[PDB]
Design a protein around this ligand. Structure first.
Ligand SMILES: NC(=O)c1ccccc1Nc1ccc(Cl)cc1
Ligand SMILES: [Cl-]
Ligand SMILES: [Cl-]
Ligand SMILES: [Cl-]
Ligand SMILES: [Cl-]
Ligand SMILES: [Cl-]
Ligand SMILES: [Mg+2]
Length: 348
């Protein structure tokens, strides 16, 4: 067991191993508080996140367990990984606080799309990395659910990591009105017409790629209905074959109220783009999720010919998510989480 030291920074008690020095507050949300620190064991600058109220309800206790399991599993160059997890507790009986440690991130993709002149080669490399990371995540039957520019970390060498997985956190208020939180979502999930599946992440990559090519948001709707009208004007209205797949009677009656529109010519929308970029966008931005290109299929598209290496695009170890259908008490979720804290083995 390491030696811990205690201090108060910005109205919060931090109790951490001596290895973490020069702690400085960097933000806080509903989920926890974050400090930047220097890790003397590894030599890296790190983010230390102290969870808030991790075991306050059954919902909160299960969310805590879900996040720790997902971060412990992810071991890939283009996905955030877990450097450390700790608690100052000496036993299950006094266990209350959980701290998570990751590499400290600088710029996100928002910064570089707003401020930088991007070549076609930059767009090829950035979208290649997102798809390499997604091939890995989807091979474990994990859905990200919240891919958007603010959840993609980028450095000065254009190297990219996926972070901030959807832990089913977002609320109704958060998705309402003129908000970036909804602009990257597939239209069948934002109107709650289909159960989530891994094809929803490929719609989000289409929206991100369009915005790197034009420097503008593809579907900046003022509310759910405005956003659906922007989507259908570009890709056209649902065909009868797609209508057949919708369960809700009330969903079908609404779609059927709209005038029919054809799919637009994407070369006349993305004016001057690489023809191979236009072809890949037409394969991602498909209304019927069964017909969208997969991450593994996209990596072999001719747009990525200069980066594609089928011997260096790894898949994940198998991931057991059977806990998601399990009904437990707060103290049972808390015991499972304690075992995952004490069994953690750091990377090389
Ligand atoms: N297969 C699907 O993709 C799907 C399945 C069930 C329910 C909805 C669906 N997709 C959808 C329907 C209508 C519209 Cl406008 C946009 C996407
Ligand atoms: Cl230490
Ligand atoms: Cl990492
Ligand atoms: Cl504790
Ligand atoms: Cl964003
Ligand atoms: Cl597993
Ligand atoms: Mg985020």
């Amino acid at each position: 067991r390491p030696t811990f030291y205690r201090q108060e920074l910005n109205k919060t008690i931090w109790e951490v191993p001596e290895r973490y020095q020069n702690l400085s507050p960097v933000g806080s949300g509903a989920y926890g508080s974050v400090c930047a620190a220097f890790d003397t064991k590894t030599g890296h600058r790190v983010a230390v996140k102290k969870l808030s109220r991790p075991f306050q309800s059954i919902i909160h206790a299960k969310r805590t367990y879900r996040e720790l399991r997902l971060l412990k599993h992810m071991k890939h160059e283009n996905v955030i990984g877990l450097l450390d997890v700790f608690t100052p507790a000496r036993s299950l009986e006094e266990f209350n606080d959980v701290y998570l440690v990751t590499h400290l991130m600088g710029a996100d993709l928002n910064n570089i799309v707003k401020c930088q002149k991007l070549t076609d080669d930059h767009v090829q490399f950035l979208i290649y990395q997102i798809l390499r990371g997604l091939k890995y995540i989807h091979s474990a039957d994990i859905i990200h659910r919240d891919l958007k520019p603010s959840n993609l970390a980028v450095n000065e060498d254009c190297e990219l990591k996926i972070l901030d997985f959807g832990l089913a956190r977002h609320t109704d208020d958060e998705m309402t009105g003129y908000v970036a939180t909804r602009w990257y979502r597939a239209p069948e999930i934002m109107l709650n017409w289909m159960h989530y599946n891994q094809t929803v992440d490929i719609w989000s990559v289409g929206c991100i790629m369009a915005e790197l090519l034009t420097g503008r948001t593809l579907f900046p709707g003022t509310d759910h209905i405005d956003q659906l009208k922007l989507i259908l004007r570009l890709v056209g209205t649902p065909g009868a074959e797609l209508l057949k797949k919708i369960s809700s009677e009330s969903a079908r009656n609404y779609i059927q109220s709209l005038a029919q529109m054809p799919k637009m010519n994407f070369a006349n929308v993305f004016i001057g783009a690489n023809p191979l970029a236009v072809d890949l966008l037409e394969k991602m931005l498909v209304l019927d999720s069964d017909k969208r290109i997969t991450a593994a299929q996209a990596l072999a598209h001719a747009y990525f010919a200069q980066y594609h290496d089928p011997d260096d695009e790894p898949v994940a170890d198998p991931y057991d998510q059977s806990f998601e259908s399990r009904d437990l008490l707060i103290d049972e979720w808390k015991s499972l989480t304690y075992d995952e804290v004490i069994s953690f083995v750091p990377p090389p």
